[PDB]
Amino acid sequence: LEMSLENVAFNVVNKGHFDGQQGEVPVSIINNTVYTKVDGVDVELFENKTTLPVNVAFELWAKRNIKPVPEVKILNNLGVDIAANTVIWDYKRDAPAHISTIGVCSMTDIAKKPTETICAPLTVFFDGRVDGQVDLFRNARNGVLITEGSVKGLQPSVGPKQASLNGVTLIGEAVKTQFNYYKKVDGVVQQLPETYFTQSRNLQEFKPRSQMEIDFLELAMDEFIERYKLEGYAFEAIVYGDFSHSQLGGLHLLIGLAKRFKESPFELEDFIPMDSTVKNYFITDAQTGSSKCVCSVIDLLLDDFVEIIKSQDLSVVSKVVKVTIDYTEISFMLWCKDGHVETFYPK
Amino acid sequence: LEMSLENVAFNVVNKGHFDGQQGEVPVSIINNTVYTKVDGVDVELFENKTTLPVNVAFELWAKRNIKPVPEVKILNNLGVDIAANTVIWDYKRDAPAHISTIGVCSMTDIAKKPTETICAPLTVFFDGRVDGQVDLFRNARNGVLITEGSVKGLQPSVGPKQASLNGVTLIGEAVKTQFNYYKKVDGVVQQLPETYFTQSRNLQEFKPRSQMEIDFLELAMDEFIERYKLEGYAFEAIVYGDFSHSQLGGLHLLIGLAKRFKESPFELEDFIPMDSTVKNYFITDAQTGSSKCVCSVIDLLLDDFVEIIKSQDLSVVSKVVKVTIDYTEISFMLWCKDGHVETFYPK
Amino acid sequence: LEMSLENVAFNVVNKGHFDGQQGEVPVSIINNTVYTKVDGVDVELFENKTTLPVNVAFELWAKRNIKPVPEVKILNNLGVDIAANTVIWDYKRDAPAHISTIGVCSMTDIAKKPTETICAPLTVFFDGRVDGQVDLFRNARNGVLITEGSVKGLQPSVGPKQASLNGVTLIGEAVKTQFNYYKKVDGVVQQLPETYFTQSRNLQEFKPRSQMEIDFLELAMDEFIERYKLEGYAFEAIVYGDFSHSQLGGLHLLIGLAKRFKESPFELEDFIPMDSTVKNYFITDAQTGSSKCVCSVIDLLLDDFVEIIKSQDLSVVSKVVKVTIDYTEISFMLWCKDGHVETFYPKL
Amino acid sequence: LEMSLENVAFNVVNKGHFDGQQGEVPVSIINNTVYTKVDGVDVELFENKTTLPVNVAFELWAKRNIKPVPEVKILNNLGVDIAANTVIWDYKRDAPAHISTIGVCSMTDIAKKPTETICAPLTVFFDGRVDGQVDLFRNARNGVLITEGSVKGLQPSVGPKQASLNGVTLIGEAVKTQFNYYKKVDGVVQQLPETYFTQSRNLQEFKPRSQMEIDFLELAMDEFIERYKLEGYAFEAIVYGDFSHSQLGGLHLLIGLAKRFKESPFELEDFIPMDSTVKNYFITDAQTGSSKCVCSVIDLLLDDFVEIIKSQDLSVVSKVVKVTIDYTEISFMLWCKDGHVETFYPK
Amino acid sequence: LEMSLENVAFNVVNKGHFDGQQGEVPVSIINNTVYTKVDGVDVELFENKTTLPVNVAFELWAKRNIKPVPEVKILNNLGVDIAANTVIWDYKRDAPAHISTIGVCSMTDIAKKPTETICAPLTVFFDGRVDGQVDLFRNARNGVLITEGSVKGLQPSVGPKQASLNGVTLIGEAVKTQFNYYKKVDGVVQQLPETYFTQSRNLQEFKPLHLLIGLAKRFKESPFELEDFIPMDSTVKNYFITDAQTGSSKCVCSVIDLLVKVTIDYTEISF
RNA sequence: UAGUAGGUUGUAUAGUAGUAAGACCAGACCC
RNA sequence: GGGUCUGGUCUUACUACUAUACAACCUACUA
């Protein structure tokens, strides 16, 4: 089997997600909210924040993937258009990561199997922990495959350490959250270039993942620059920021935002609440009264950021640098003075 | 069995009402409308005009009674509070005639059988064309029973000739629309009083049902009164109406409204769109510019109204007359100008 | 008292409009509809088609004017911005004719009396059948006054014969629907221009109001033109209409639309459902398959239209003619050639 | 172009449809209705009855095709999935006939030209009155082409006489509403089979289109059979209908419905308000009280129906007959008594 | 009395709850929100999260009980179906704890007094701090009574130490939040058996994996997410716990906050 | 007199439209 | 080659709307 609204609500009530049990419960759809009657009183089960109909969005939310899955930004950068026999929920915007589905909900389904002709001109995300998906990826024309282990006859590409698990990114210890990515286009397997992976942290629950990051949060700016020999790279304004004018200077790394937040609180108004490698924020410092309309914040490991920034050479005043991050090219606007660097920020 | 939204929509699509078949179709609930996907495009199936949730109202509408059923005004006057194992749809206001149901929809059910203790202090409408309902009526404490035939041990009460059938009232020829009404209160059968029944007609599809009505519509105002000897009974004002002042005079019978509508069109704004024995209208005559804020219109057979007015014994100046219409008392405001009648209109 | 939602609903239930009685009834506001509980079941009382909140629109609808009132187009053309101590309901779009009110609903009120300073730079519609309104009009700076009779010290202006009464326009017989209009601007009484008044009819309930209209509805096109000496005025196109090409021809008078509708049914899609002197329609003829995207239809008495079309010389290649209709200037495009008119249509 | 909501509303206000002019007007989107401010008061321009967003549906409605276009049922039967550079509005359900568009609205566009790779595995409706569309049809892989005239190198297929024009079907006189249909699948032109075309009439504005229909609407049931020699074809029940039992007998042609409506009014509740060759109705006769839950009504010319019924032979008790109507197969359930056909109704 | 929407909004504006004052203020009902006009600009007063109409829910919210009241789980376990002359607001789901009311709001009222025949086959929650309610409980057929003190002729049952007060549970010091529970069924007083009472704490404001104390200890150690897929109030809570450090998650986790059939909160819990 | 300015009108360079007609180009049908 | 019908463009005459520049009239605030 039954694929109906009341069976989905029964599964949500008894297990929190659509498992596949048999049963039905009373359901009331008023406004965009789905209520259920428990002990004679209506209890809210789901509030629709999406653009889909109420029952369609509820069914997709209940059938979401609860296993560790790749972050939505990785899938978007890899060009994934649809997911095979699963729903990947984008918790950043509280909506499904993909408009259509394959064999999940009859209202949004374009097919019941990923091997149909309609699914051929689409990059389909194939899981690896579900049996039989590797064969479907081999027979698919366009598809992206993730695997905990290794696949015979293919060259694995190491992905990010962290992965999304019910909306909270983590480096799994009990469960393996590091996958191997395979991309197949037009029936030909394509290798993927080596890329630096964003750590996807947050200001509140910020924890350094390296010794250099620990020194950045604790040691002074001059001491940290002197110890690691970061002179002549404009590290004062690129990371720490300039809270002295009406507009901020630099501050394009999430680690600098975390350091400033620990020093003085401020507001990060995200005017595009989605998940992406590069985030734009409406930052307003509450102490110095300095605000910036657009602030491109990219969360990178500090050691790899140093390696990236020191592998471009100081020879021209201005240059555009293309860096492969999350399997996509990132355009960095680089300004260089003579002897030192002026400014290096993402576009 | 399955009791779900998609099975109900499948039954509506394939048969127009909930029959009890097995199947499911895609359903989208957006706004108060229930859409279904037919040939890849959404088709509207039901628009909620009720005060209930969208899916609850849709399920009640699909499970409505399609057999000839008594008019909602008769049930309200008899004091019916709930219907046993059926839904009676009030097409006048496009909502169920009763707030709760017995064994129909889990969201509105108060019980699964009419014999439970919760249903005891309620007048339950028991059908007669469904097997086993007569026994339930006998065992019920408060209930109203309708029967095409006769029931042993009970005195039948003849009901109205017409009955509702999918929202259009008719005097059935192929199907019997005349029932026998039995009312049982506190376990004791009560014999219903002798009463007149409203014909429940409309101005557009108005057809006379007696010789007197045909003469009323065909003959002039003076000719009709002279032929039937209605002098000194205010038939000109009460029935025909007086469109000569800023406010109307009389016009409290639907037959007079039909005659005027055939003569000159006008607007009847019903500010309480429900079904009742006495209707109040905001009548505005479009020819003479005469309007009346409240106009109590009661549809009665002309012969019965003549009998009622001739039995009034007009001797006192003012008197309140109680007339049993549709198993309920109707308060008629009677004014008599000593010698003849002054005005006789319902309150 | 009391000015509350439940008292308003009680008045609607017991009398159909807000009279001023004391009482309350259960009320449920869900969606844009206002329901009431009668005999244990919810009954719909009002569905909000306006741009106002549900209870605000319900209160304005209940307090609407039920007496014969001037049509909304006349008020808009006269420049009326607000109504004094009343609500004028625009039944064409099922919303109040004016955004704000004076002493009606606390949510929309800008004042409690029309004599306040905020109401001074506004043209206020003052009634005449309500006692004391004439004095307010005299003391007002900008205002429009209607009166069944005559007012001392002022020159009356005769208005249209018909007036709106609960959404249906009529030439009242029992009740006088013809008023005298007075307009006062900046404390100085202004006389209103002499004008022709639109009859405001409809295709379904269309009834001729003159001998010429009866002849038009009965006689053939050629016979009517011959009888009324309308030679060389494009009456075949301007009025009767030309359903011969892909686009329509002329057909800019409602009487011609009524004649065609009686001949062959068609659809008039009104893409701006409001009330105005000149109406634009998306007419699609169902017989010949001829449709026109924009069709300016103005309802005028056929004698008045004949006089208007005979009052303009036709030697110029083209000209824009301004005609005072419903106290406003209507622009007519006079595309003519060699004396005989080619077309004559308003704009909207 | 400018493609914005206010430009679309300006075009609607000044011309009734999106022509392509430059300008803007105030717009208010509250509920599903789009209002505009004219002379200081909001005027409703469009009420959304679709499943699309308010502004998307408004833009599609304004950019609809106002020229004579084929009826939506013909396009659905031909398998049209999308329309090239135009929007075909389905006035029966007040929604666009196709979910996606090509180069019309950026919210629903899948491409800007019909020659892109994404549009290749889709049957695209190509007009013929727009210059350059014939070349696109020739270069297209899957597409349907209509032409007023003839196309060199292709065999024309004569379509229906009538065509939709702003929601009202008509046999155009001033404008040609008869097209020639060409279907191309997988780059190979397919000839369409000879077929019968539904006249697509309605009960209210019903006008006979042949001598036989006039005789049917005037002559008696027995006289009409005698004159046209229809004995042993169950013409009494198939077309006229039988209002004698609880359920109707036959009445599967719209001409019979029109005749009955002229005789006695009744209600046709369409529980699937869409456009299709075969329509199912919830017919309830208001005179005899006879109702039928499902009534398959197909509007065919009486001469064509006679030709169909006289070419099936009377040899088996039950048989399924496939008839090509509107370029699609119609399944007719045929029951034959030994000697004469018993019941012949569409499924 | 006056019982109208504008009087209720006036009471909310001037006192925060329906006290019973006389007055009216402009009110706008758009969407499910009730706005009021203060200084010429609309100010939101109430957003409807319930299944009731906007004005009905607003009137019930304004007429809610602000005194210390028993927790909703205790009332549900005791079988309370309706409250006499008061509204008990369930702050966990932001909706009234009972579908119908007695003499509060005309849209939801089934009666004006708890002594009517319609209220007889219902367990009615009778207060004890309101004068005259004890007599109504004595005359009632089915009802539950709470009392700060003692009632003559009845055996008191000691209830939980904590009680709800404007949505925050507390062990009252200035005000007594410990009541004595009396249950009367079919006109016969039934004694309440001994039972253990849930402390009803929370992880954030916790002051001394199926016990809430273990959840609090883990939260102090490592943060995690508790997705409550049934946001209501009950003795036993099911959570969708996902540990953010070890990546360990459990779909259903029955968490009961305590200091085989077990008598907890006047009901039976099966382990 | 030296400056900063809101409404009305005119001139100049421009860009769209207008429910009539004529002309040019292109396509279809017929002779 | 001619006639009719459609898609695009120009002209006929008068007006409406948007953009910029300058001037005049009624006049507003300072030295």
XYZ file of N, CA and C in Angstrom, chain B residues 14 48 90 117 124 188 192 229 304 316:
30
model
N -13.081 6.233 -10.911
C -13.624 5.145 -11.710
C -15.136 4.996 -11.605
N -12.997 21.875 -1.398
C -13.565 21.818 -0.056
C -14.259 23.136 0.263
N -25.465 17.603 2.510
C -26.358 18.754 2.395
C -25.882 19.595 1.217
N -22.673 2.914 23.675
C -23.198 3.766 24.738
C -23.098 5.245 24.386
N -30.511 8.994 16.149
C -29.741 8.427 15.050
C -30.691 8.105 13.908
N -39.184 4.605 23.798
C -40.632 4.603 23.633
C -40.955 5.197 22.270
N -45.744 10.529 15.337
C -45.542 11.881 14.855
C -46.886 12.552 14.574
N -63.235 31.956 -4.279
C -63.902 32.656 -3.182
C -62.931 32.935 -2.032
N -53.302 23.488 0.628
C -53.054 23.399 2.062
C -53.042 24.778 2.710
N -60.207 37.685 16.629
C -59.339 38.574 17.388
C -58.481 39.386 16.425
